Design a protein around this ligand. Structure first.
Ligand SMILES: NC(=O)c1ccc[n+]([C@@H]2O[C@H](COP(=O)([O-])OP(=O)(O)OC[C@H]3O[C@@H](n4cnc5c(N)ncnc54)[C@H](OP(=O)(O)O)[C@@H]3O)[C@@H](O)[C@H]2O)c1
Ligand SMILES: C[C@]12CC/C(=N/O)C=C1CC[C@@H]1[C@@H]2CC[C@@]2(C)[C@H]1CC[C@@]2(O)Cc1ccccn1
Ligand code: NA
Ligand code: NA
Ligand code: NA
Ligand code: NA
Ligand code: NA
Length: 318
């Protein structure tokens, strides 16, 4: 179950989310990425920022060498981190990810975020008060360096993440554009369903890829503990009982039926195997309408640090 991207490549519509907080041992990413592949995940979502490409790569190499899958059956995503937006930094950043993952190419390379940061050793470069230092980079120059990565065969497809409509339009209207972004990977779940941005992406043949589709890991440093807990939503819970599924499976199936490509992070063997059950059942039109009604424009991730960035994607909300 794949979608045709606007460059003619194919993306599986269910993806495995590999981010775990830093407190989780790096060994787990190797263990659960192999379990995800065993359960039937073929789209694997990673990034420089996640500090796991060595382990995710090794799980992929392992399941190819064990005869479970071939390289072409796996759809591997990496992401260019915000310290590597300056165009001369882009290709060495991809080559560094390919070296860590020990893959020859990624299926998909994203601009992780439009919010450029100062280059350096540090992935979060901070001043004396822990205030992050921003960089002013025309992301069209970043996009041209991504396009060269595709021409070099190092990335099959290129796309973006955390972009709003205005920032997508900046790439779509770039003079001499060669490659449209195949996708925009954004926060998307029933409390933030991104219906308008979804329609916009559909009209431009850009796939919306949902992250935090199960309501995020609710890490204290990023997510207000007072925020409503998606998987305890009474409507999701009532729909789970109706279908004899789980709230997680309702939330994933919602995304599939609205033409969204959905990620699902789990480090738990039972839940990893449960999540592939999304292909096994259907929501009614009335079920879809009830989930649509849960929308509240709630982004789980907040940063007053990034709120002030010129490229803050939520920047003109109020
Ligand atoms: N582009 C970006 O800026 C960005 C940002 C954030 C994330 N991402 C990507 O998107 C992925 C997923 O988003 P996320 O990390 O926020 O997590 P998520 O997919 O919203 O999942 C949140 C939590 O749901 C639990 N869960 C999973 N399956 C379940 C099931 N069947 N029943 C009950 N609970 C279940 C997991 O806990 P257990 O592990 O205990 O099962 C997980 O911690 C990330 O891993 C990452 O790859 C991208
Ligand atoms: C650390 C983090 C939260 C936990 C997690 N769970 O899977 C995964 C990640 C990795 C990506 C991070 C994210 C936090 C927010 C980051 C840093 C983002 C990238 C770019 C972004 O600035 C996007 C943004 C969004 C909302 C408000 C302000 N900024
Ligand atoms: Na991410
Ligand atoms: Na515009
Ligand atoms: Na929050
Ligand atoms: Na906002
Ligand atoms: Na404002």
């Amino acid at each position: 179950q794949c979608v045709k991207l606007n460059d003619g490549h194919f993306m599986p519509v269910l993806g495995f989310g590999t981010y775990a907080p830093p407190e989780v041992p790096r060994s787990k990413a190797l263990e659960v990425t192999k379990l995800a592949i065993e359960a039937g995940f073929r789209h694997i979502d990673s990034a420089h920022l996640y500090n796991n490409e060595e382990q995710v790569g090794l799980a992929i190499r392992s399941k190819i060498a064990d005869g479970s899958v071939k390289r072409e059956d796996i759809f591997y995503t990496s992401k260019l981190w915000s310290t590597f937006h300056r165009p001369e930094l882009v290709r060495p950043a991809l080559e560094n990810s390919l070296k860590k993952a020990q893959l020859d190419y990624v299926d998909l390379y994203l601009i992780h975020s439009p919010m450029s940061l100062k280059p350096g050793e540090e992935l979060s470069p901070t001043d004396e008060n822990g205030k992050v230092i921003f960089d002013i980079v025309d992301l069209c120059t970043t996009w041209e360096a991504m396009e060269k990565c595709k021409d070099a065969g190092l990335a099959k497809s290129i796309g973006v993440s955390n972009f709003n409509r205005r920032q997508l339009e900046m790439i779509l209207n770039k003079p001499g554009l060669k490659y449209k972004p195949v996708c925009n990977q954004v926060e998307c779940h029933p409390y933030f369903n991104r219906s308008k941005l979804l329609d916009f992406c559909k009209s431009k043949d850009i796939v919306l890829v949902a992250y935090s589709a199960l309501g995020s890991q609710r890490d204290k440093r990023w997510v207000d503990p007072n925020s409503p807990v998606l998987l305890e939503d009474p409507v999701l819970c009532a729909l789970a009982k109706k279908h004899k599924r789980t709230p997680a499976l309702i939330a994933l199936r919602y995304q599939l039926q609205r033409g969204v490509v959905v990620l699902a992070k789990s480090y738990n063997e039972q839940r990893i195997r449960q999540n592939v059950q999304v292909f096994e059942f259907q929501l009614t039109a009335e079920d879809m309408k009830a989930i649509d009604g849960l929308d509240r424009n709630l982004h789980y991730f907040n940063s007053d640090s990034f709120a002030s960035h010129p490229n803050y994607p939520y920047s003109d909300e109020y």
